[PDB]
With several copies, the nearest count.
Chain A
Amino acid sequence: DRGIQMLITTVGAFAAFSLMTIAVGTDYWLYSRGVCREEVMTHSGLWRTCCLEGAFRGVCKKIDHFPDTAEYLLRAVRASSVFPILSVTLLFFGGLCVAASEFHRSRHSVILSAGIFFVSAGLSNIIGIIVYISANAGSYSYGWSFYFGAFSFIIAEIVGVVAVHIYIEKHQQLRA
């Protein structure tokens, strides 16, 4: 099933990267009641907050991420969205390795490295989610951008597993 395995890997890598990039771009992480500048229903993301109703509806303002070392570091890390961006980077590199595999069948470690990138992307994603949620804590709901990030994590981990299976089976078959 190597053809199907590679198909799953490529489709999944693209899906994870697309979902994660959209999530980092779009502004439907959180539904709360803040202000785009009275408090009304809004819809914030990682960078901008926007009004969901009333006169200033459609108006968005840059999130004042800033207004205790730990509080400072959390605020810093959440302000820059280090971890969502790092997960996007690693998904990109994983996709590059998956693409490069076919054009260079000589070296095995390419697809292995793809797998490892994907796994690491998932871990960065988790850290991101935790930092985001924790920084918010310092009524509400989560939007579809948040869930895009979550589904990116799941798919990334699946693709990592499949990639490592491909590498394992190549070394198992060729060695014996």
Chain B
Amino acid sequence: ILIGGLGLAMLVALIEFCYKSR
């Protein structure tokens, strides 16, 4: 669950970054 959450966190960070970019 820990490593899953770290993966998920990175994914959400990418999504939010792309959203704030455009």
Give A contacts to B, CB under 8 Å.
Answer: 116, 119-120, 123, 126-127
| Count, chain B residues at interface, CB 8 A | 4
Contact with A along B1-22 (1 / 0, CB 8 A): 0010011001000000000000
| Given A116-B10, A120-B10, A126-B3, 5 further pairs, Cβ under 8 A | A119-B10, A123-B3, A123-B6, A123-B7, A127-B3
Closest to B6 in A: A123
Q: Which residues of B contact A120 (CB under 8 A)?
A: 10
- Chain A min CB distance to B11 (Å): 11
In the complex, chain B residues whose CB is within 8 Å of the CB of A116: 10
Residues of B within 8 A of A119 (CB): 10
Tell me, rounded to whole Å, the shortest Cβ–Cβ distance linking A131 to chain B.
11
Q: In the assembled complex, which residues on chain A have CB atoms less than 8 Å from the CB atom of B3?
A: 123, 126-127
Q: What 4 A-B pairs have minimum CB-CB distances, sorted nearest first?
A: A127-B3, A123-B3, A123-B6, A126-B3
